[PDB]
């Protein structure tokens, strides 16, 4: 719950989390 999935309309969505200050697109 500490991914945030950012919902960008550009047609893609990314779990950014400062964790590792990176959006990331593999599937966790």
Same mark, same amino acid.
Do not use: Q
């Given at each position: 719950?500490?991914?945030?999935?950012?919902?960008?309309?550009?047609?893609? =969505?990314?779990?950014?989390?400062?964790?590792?200050?990176?959006? =990331?697109?593999?599937?966790?």
């Amino acid at each position: 719950s500490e991914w945030t999935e950012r919902k960008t309309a550009d047609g893609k =969505t990314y779990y950014y989390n400062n964790r590792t200050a990176e959006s =990331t697109w593999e599937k966790p």
